[PDB]
Design a protein around this ligand. Structure first.
Ligand SMILES: O=P([O-])([O-])O[C@@H]1[C@H](O)[C@H](O)[C@@H](O)[C@H](O)[C@H]1O
Ligand SMILES: O=P([O-])([O-])O[C@@H]1[C@H](O)[C@H](O)[C@@H](O)[C@H](O)[C@H]1O
Ligand SMILES: [Ca+2]
Ligand SMILES: [Ca+2]
Ligand SMILES: [Ca+2]
Ligand SMILES: [Ca+2]
Ligand SMILES: [Ca+2]
Ligand SMILES: [Ca+2]
Ligand SMILES: [Ca+2]
Ligand SMILES: [Ca+2]
Ligand SMILES: [Ca+2]
Ligand SMILES: [Ca+2]
Lengths: 152, 150, 151
């Protein structure tokens, strides 16, 4: 009760210090390759890789390829693409069933920002998705190299 | 009961303090410098002043603004490490011959190289810091290392 | 009463902090870091001679990569492979030729020498590099290798 009192007051000061310090470091971490939106964080590796390699990199790091689920998330992701001036791969593919794009979990899309006419499975071999500097999406061959951006 | 939960909380906080301390060192390696309560971090690339300024602002910070010999030395470490002169936040764009911080406040510290600022060519309103730590006013259109402070 | 509620509220903040921190740790490690046990390896992304690399890590509050187990070596190997550049380890045999030690002076507790190593080629190889295949080779300290520090 009494001793417990001080202990609680001491913890409050320690917690406040951690909160202030962490707040500062979050900003530091995101500069210049990250974007925070809601409770999601997008971070680019800064280089390009084919889809399979990009996917593995994100998976191994405990995240997954960028998967914008709203206009807000897509705009945040667009900021990184614009900054690096390099279109990036999204996590979604229609490799299982042509014409039906899904997230790595198999769930159907809850948001999309396809450029006019897309997806068009050009050449009959486009099962991956890239996001342009203007934020629009286009289905593209998974063998192509695009900016690696993961979400955590 | 409450005494058992408090010890559990104490343990969680001690763990966080240890984990956070380790994480701070990791984050700052190799592009950051901690001095006092300020943190300097370089983006690792060069940009013209206006662009560099926007990058820092959008990140929730601002261009490096050394306010003491100690901060200037910390900033100097990053410049030396990348071997690339960097832009500071200060400019005399509003009133030629009078440098101020983004807020409009006058300088509280300066480390100008001999003869500077000299508004060379009548068009130097930005400031760069060299690997030796000294400052020189330069054209804002030139590209220099982007270093922000948080 | 008020104390208990004050403690439960404090724990709510602490667990929220734990969650935020966990997310930011993963973000931090991507793509230049690797965590293994309580150790963290992080590459600077560039190459430097041994003395300079050692100074960079020391000044950052850590030390050059010092894998002490197969698990740590495999973790470090991931970074070397990602950068496709052999990296320097912290150990040297500068004090006593043929006897590699950590910066502390302690003898190795783990090694993963490539066949035929360490050979002290030219009679002047007192530093250690780790290849993309995870094997070690003694190399001249003047050579430039990927900088990887451990924290
Ligand atoms: O192959 P390319 O003609 O250079 O470029 C193609 C066009 O931009 C097309 O509109 C788009 O739908 C394809 O995905 C792209 O591959
Ligand atoms: O134009 P430059 O002669 O190559 O270099 C100039 C000189 O170093 C001058 O002393 C300095 O005050 C100017 O800011 C620089 O631009
Ligand atoms: Ca298909
Ligand atoms: Ca398709
Ligand atoms: Ca297409
Ligand atoms: Ca002027
Ligand atoms: Ca001027
Ligand atoms: Ca000048
Ligand atoms: Ca970081
Ligand atoms: Ca020797
Ligand atoms: Ca030797
Ligand atoms: Ca050898």
């Amino acid at each position: 009760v009494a001793s417990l009192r001080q202990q609680v007051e001491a913890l409050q000061g320690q917690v406040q210090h951690l909160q202030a310090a962490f707040s500062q470091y979050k900003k530091v971490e995101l500069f210049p390759n990250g974007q925070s939106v809601g409770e999601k964080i997008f971070k680019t590796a800064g280089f390009v890789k084919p889809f399979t390699e990009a996917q593995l990199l994100c998976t191994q790091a405990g995240g997954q390829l960028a998967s914008p689920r709203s206009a807000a998330e897509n705009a945040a992701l667009q900021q990184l693409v614009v900054a690096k001036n390099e279109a990036a791969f999204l996590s979604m593919t229609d490799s299982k069933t042509e014409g039906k794009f899904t997230y790595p979990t198999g769930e159907s899309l809850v948001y999309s920002n396809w450029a006019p006419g897309e997806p068009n499975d050009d050449g009959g071999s486009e099962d991956c998705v890239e996001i342009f500097t203007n934020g629009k999406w286009n289905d593209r061959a998974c063998g192509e190299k695009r900016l690696v951006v993961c979400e955590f």
